[PDB]
Symmetry: C3
Subunit: 593 residues, 3 copies
Amino acid sequence: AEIDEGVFETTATIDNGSFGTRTIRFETGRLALQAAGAVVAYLDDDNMLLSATTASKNPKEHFDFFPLTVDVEERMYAAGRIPGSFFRREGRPSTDAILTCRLIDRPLRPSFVDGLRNEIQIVVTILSLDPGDLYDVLAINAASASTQLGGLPFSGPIGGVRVALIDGTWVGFPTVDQIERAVFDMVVAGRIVEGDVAIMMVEAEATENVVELVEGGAQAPTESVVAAGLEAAKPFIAALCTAQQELADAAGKSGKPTVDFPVFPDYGEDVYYSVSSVATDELAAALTIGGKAERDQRIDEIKTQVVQRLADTYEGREKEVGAAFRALTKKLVRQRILTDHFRIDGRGITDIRALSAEVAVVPRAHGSALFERGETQILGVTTLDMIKMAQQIDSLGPETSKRYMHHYNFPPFSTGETGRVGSPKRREIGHGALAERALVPVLPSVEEFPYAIRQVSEALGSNGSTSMGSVCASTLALLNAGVPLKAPVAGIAMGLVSDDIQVEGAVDGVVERRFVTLTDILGAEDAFGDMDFKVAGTKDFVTALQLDTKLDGIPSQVLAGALEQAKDARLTILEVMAEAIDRPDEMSPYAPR
Amino acid sequence: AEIDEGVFETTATIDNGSFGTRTIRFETGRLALQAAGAVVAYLDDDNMLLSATTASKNPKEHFDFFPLTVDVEERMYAAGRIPGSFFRREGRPSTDAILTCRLIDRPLRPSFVDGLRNEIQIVVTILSLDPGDLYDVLAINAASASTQLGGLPFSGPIGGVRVALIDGTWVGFPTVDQIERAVFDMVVAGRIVEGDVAIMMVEAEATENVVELVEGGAQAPTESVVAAGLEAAKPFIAALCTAQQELADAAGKSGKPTVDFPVFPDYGEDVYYSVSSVATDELAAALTIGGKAERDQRIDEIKTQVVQRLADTYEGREKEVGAAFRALTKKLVRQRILTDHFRIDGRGITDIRALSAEVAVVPRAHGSALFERGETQILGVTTLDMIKMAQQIDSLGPETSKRYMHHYNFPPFSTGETGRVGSPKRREIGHGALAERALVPVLPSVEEFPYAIRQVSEALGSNGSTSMGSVCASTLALLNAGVPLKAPVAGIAMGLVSDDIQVEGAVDGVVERRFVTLTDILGAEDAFGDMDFKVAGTKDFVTALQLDTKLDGIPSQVLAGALEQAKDARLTILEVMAEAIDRPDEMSPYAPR
Amino acid sequence: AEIDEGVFETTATIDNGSFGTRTIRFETGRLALQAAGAVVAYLDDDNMLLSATTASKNPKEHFDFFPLTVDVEERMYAAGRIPGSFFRREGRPSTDAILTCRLIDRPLRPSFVDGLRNEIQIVVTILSLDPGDLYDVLAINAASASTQLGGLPFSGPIGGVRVALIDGTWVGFPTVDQIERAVFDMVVAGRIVEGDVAIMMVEAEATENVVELVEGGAQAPTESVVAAGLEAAKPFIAALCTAQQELADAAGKSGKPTVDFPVFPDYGEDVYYSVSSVATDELAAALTIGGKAERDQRIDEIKTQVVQRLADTYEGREKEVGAAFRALTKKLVRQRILTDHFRIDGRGITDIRALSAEVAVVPRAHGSALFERGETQILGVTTLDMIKMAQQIDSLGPETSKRYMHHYNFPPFSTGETGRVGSPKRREIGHGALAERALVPVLPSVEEFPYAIRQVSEALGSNGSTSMGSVCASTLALLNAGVPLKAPVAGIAMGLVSDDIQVEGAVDGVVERRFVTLTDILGAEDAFGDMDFKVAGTKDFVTALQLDTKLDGIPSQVLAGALEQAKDARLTILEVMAEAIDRPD
RNA sequence: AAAAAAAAAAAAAAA
Ligand SMILES: O=C(NC1(C(=O)O)CCCC1)c1ccc(-c2ccc(NC(=O)c3nc(-c4ccccc4)oc3C(F)(F)F)cc2)cc1
Ligand SMILES: O=C(NC1(C(=O)O)CCCC1)c1ccc(-c2ccc(NC(=O)c3nc(-c4ccccc4)oc3C(F)(F)F)cc2)cc1
Ligand SMILES: O=C(NC1(C(=O)O)CCCC1)c1ccc(-c2ccc(NC(=O)c3nc(-c4ccccc4)oc3C(F)(F)F)cc2)cc1
């Protein structure tokens, strides 16, 4: 809709029945005209933000990865307030902004064509905010729309939404007051494939009042309830994708990309062909050894022989043969998993690594614990203090103080490297936040436990999913310090592989999709997998959930089976945890009163 | 004067008649003897500072610009107290120090020979300061003197002074108490060229008491008054330059450079000669293409044709040919401007680009506005708060708090680029300070309007002079918020092109030198010019002024005409501003009372 | 001792007689199993910390120095409280952690083989701390143990300890309460050579109550007392080294280096031989000529005429020949020093450079002074304020406030260079701390002088030991501001050169070891010497001491003579300082 | 410092 010469606008509607209706509006052609693409997004006439996307003129070939950057700029004037810092100006980004950056980055990054080496930057500025609303999902939609209008090698619009379960109804785009009445709230992002929605990213948590609401008669958020909630977000995503596509069509764009971006593949087909024809049988036979040192030595020897021969042949292309060898290895391993239920370390597909749990490991700490799962090793420490030491928050959003704080540390020696030790990175912030949300619904209230609580996790050893081990260590350490939890919490990380396998016969056209689910995946198994997801909770309901994938679709029964398998693993881990400690201890003599 | 063996000193006197007399003293040969040059400067034997200049041993020519660096170090013991921060130590430079750094950098950088690639660093430390004095103008002279003593390829001494207008007298080096009785305050820097002073830098503003002083019977600072102020500053500059030269002569120095610094010109003579002979007539006729896209297409076609022709001849020297082509293009465009008032975009000499102004653009802000001039687009937003939210300042200078704050942001997408989004750079600080000084003299007093005020400028699009559009946006947004200003303020950026060309006679050796003034210059037009300046004010008097040049001299009539042209331009802009809003609105329901 | 499967343990005992006994435990095999080496250390089962060492997979030859990094992580939960900053999280390292990093880095860095270019990182995390103890000396031992278990080209275990003098007894690992009753506090680190302890690093200071305790009957810490304190620390170091070696033996390790690390020497043997055989006699003759600028120009032309005739013989190896030429110059100069008592600037071995002192150089400052020694030039400024302006400290250690603050600045132009001006580096922090500790013992009490004091030193010109010059400048400025010091303090920096020399007999190969001590060394002389040390104090006792060395041993009489020479220089400097000012203004 | 031109397991020194 060309409201003005050169200005176009589009609208999407969110219908919640008796809970109200909301409108989302996209506008282009009036602000930031020198960017590659720019869009203004409105929610209900009082929420307003701007998104802009630009690309660099020339690529950076010497990089080995795609350089995408996302930035979120919160302005205090959006809340009608002057900043409280000493210099009265906005400084380094807050935790909320970093989490929003991660939420945008997770689904957009795999949507670009592989091999791209130009720099892409996306900047989102918050301009006006109603005191009872949240801006993050609107930001996801605006970033997608501006990138779509930028005319880049970018795959289709992406839609995002939040849904909260209230009295048996999944409400879309709820307010803070409404979220205060729900048992579960979930952020979901996806795209449209062949007229259907394919889910790409999920980030979900139980609310802080879930136990009291369930005692009052509400439904508890179990696995099937969460699956139904995933089903209820698809129409909203479809409406948002349609509005974005209409905006792109109205304002020209669509076809004629004009600017062409070169791509830099890791290896050429000619190099890959030689490596396959030379080392297929050797690699296939070598995997059956399964002896760690013997397996590694055989792999290294075959790699050295192949690289020597192909360096004699291709005359100075060593990285390409190295990449092709790894690709062939991964291709063989995936087929072996799908055919024989073979895992790289010899476990069955439902087996957990060796487990151990201990408490009281640090002499003068208020509480501490050590948790081990295979080569993953987490140390947790708890400290209690007076309630005035709660963190005071001066951000744009509605939060004003934080009674319970969780900090996560990942040093370089955890995997045996060297590196800088300094301020935490974005991934550390994300993992810490996910582990923090898993414990919040089970903490006691302030009136019955008047203390500030700080929890610290140290990843002393890493071989896959330290964030799920932080949950278990947090539970054990909090119980060791005398905090009266409502129920213990545990977590697990899971993977999924899938591909087309020909059934016993002929005609080579009866190949059908086949899926396999793996429990407690290794660090290397994540690269071979097709979907990753982490689940945490008590023995009665789920408290945190995270997911990201690339598949075009997933049958409902496959997802239900995977969720059930994760629940079984969680129960097994809770049984081991209970043997170390099963009730709160006495408070430490060193802690205050 | 050799007061001590190896120690020399020189004096300059500044006579203000009935307002007093002051002396500036330069000393060398005592402190910091391992630097290339070092000088100590005194003002009235209680203000004392040190300046030192050093150069790197080897050139580093993998850069394309001259690497000069200026640093100012404020020591809190110069005011006699311990720093108030948590660690009791001076940290990041304050705003005043950054502004002093830029005042030093602006005149000194073009005074070095072109092609230099050695790193040059200047450090100025403030050692002792009287409570009623300002140190910046003293620092300019010290920075010039220490560089002059270092035996570098540096063109002559530079003198700097501040003049303030009090009761019809222009007083040099005034105190803080004297500035409270003045209507105008100007900082001027220049050099000596054949017995006469050539002005190079100006930074000037109207004082905070100008309106009531003019109501009391003082003369308002109009354009002719400002020009008389520039005339009054020359004798002080001449005296300071003479003192510096005398000190340089007394301590040896003078000649005998000893160390020789290599230079790295952009292009050689042969390449320029070839490029000129190949394309002088092709470029001369190709400027007539009014169409922007057609113009640039023809330009790039000609450049590529020249590059392909000359690639084989010079074995591949593409940088030199690219530089020579641009040099020839600029040389021809300047001739077209001087001969027949040609402009690159087709405007006439006194034409402004298309203007637009609008208010009430951000839904929940206290006040907001959008201002557009050509491709320059500025968004301004106002916030009001309680008086306790004024900024508290802890610095060397006499200022202790700020009731009105202005912050200016320049994101990479405004030009279409990618880059870091972090703390603001020095140029952002400078532009914001200029725009703040433009609006200070018309604000209401605290007794009349008891609020703290924060103003933010976002440069959403930029093609030349965003700082002057910040002034218009600030006035519009402040009126939208309900602030009762005494008068609206507008600003404009101006250019000047000069050269001597053949007169309408014979011989081909008789040439007259002419000047052309351009209104509202583009970003590209700044590189074609010999002077650029900016003027802001009301319909009655000037409030801010900035000027940079490197011309040997400018006749009085030329400068008067340029200032009159700028006045007409800002009056035209004020008329357009008044249609959008001409009186204060009602204060927002969201603002406090 | 394998307490658990894969876990090994070892113990060391520190016996202080009637002052008590303490135990240190080392444990390995249970925490951080993916590092190259990791060790947990305990002191009396309430103090616990962890140390881990890792190495990079590939070298990096584009550097020209050995890249070693040391990090100390103080966790506030070790003290049982939440951090007080706005974000409630630990940020940049505090001054204490940086000084602990320096204490670890000083003795460990020269213990690696020459030419190593792999990156090496050591990280020490503080987990539990008793309120009356100090963790730094424990950290030294833990870092040594984890590096020794890592299987790297590392030269033997290193042991560190603190000893304090209380009522005539040197007590090892004293508590905070015990330090309040002592006159001197000293940190010492060393290693074992053929059954004996060789000292490598020393960092010592007098306490804040020394004057009052000496007035009450205690013995003042003179030079011989400090020398005896060095002897008293050796058995403790031996016991700690033994425990570390036992732990290394128990958990495998010991031999079998397995992974091999390439080395990158500055020059090859052939290049050095070619450079020496072409220029030895000529260079020695140039050294024998008594002239500074003449020898400078002669050497500069010799370098040009030697690089030019070997450029064809060695293909693009100019850096190798330059390094070999510099090494040969160093060897000849050291030989000349040991034989004829030669110094490059012509001074005698007990001579100080030209001195000058002046006060009241900054017009509005509360106190100010300018101090010059040779090309070293220091400016010092003092400011006084209300006692509420004292620094408030929130950290693991027992300190909570700081009445006297000293800040040291080292701008690039003091050498003639260009560089970044900004946050102070670790070396600036260390030098400032040494200068602050030298002056703390003579300050008046808060009761008789109720002010906060900030002292700033700025190295306007540097050619060797600005740290000791800042002590003199601070004394002068404090007196100029009116602070009633109990006594003035001065300092000096000293060097020592040692090597084997031919006897006056025969056989051509019968040699003896000789030592020579130099007063007030230049920056260039620090590279020639085998040991360097700095001493500061009053006319009656020592207040600060710092020492670094690599020698396998030092006879007692040689060290006593060196300390006496330093004391004589200190007295001369105090006499020059008394002329400028001899009482508070 | 002058100028429109982040993803992932992958400090030492006068210089
Ligand atoms: O912890 C982790 N991440 C976090 C978590 O909490 O989870 C903690 C911090 C944030 C999240 C983590 C994640 C990934 C890894 C990992 C390590 C190694 C390999 N790499 C191979 O694993 C391999 N590489 C080869 C090969 C290479 C070149 C040529 C030929 C072969 O072969 C093989 C073969 F499969 F055999 F083992 C993959 C992943 C470890 C830990
Ligand atoms: O917005 C601004 N804002 C600022 C303000 O406060 O003002 C904010 C902070 C300071 C600035 C700004 C915006 C753009 C510019 C700019 C200037 C020059 C060129 N350069 C060409 O533009 C060009 N390059 C060629 C050429 C190149 C290669 C070969 C041959 C020819 O030709 C040409 C031809 F002149 F014709 F147009 C571009 C942009 C400056 C300022
Ligand atoms: O100020 C200082 N302050 C510090 C302090 O102490 O607190 C502050 C914190 C720590 C230090 C300081 C100042 C200067 C130095 C320094 C040392 C060595 C050299 N280097 C030569 O000096 C040389 N280089 C050659 C040569 C070069 C090329 C080829 C052949 C020979 O020859 C020679 C020859 F020995 F003759 F003099 C220069 C400067 C050290 C410290």
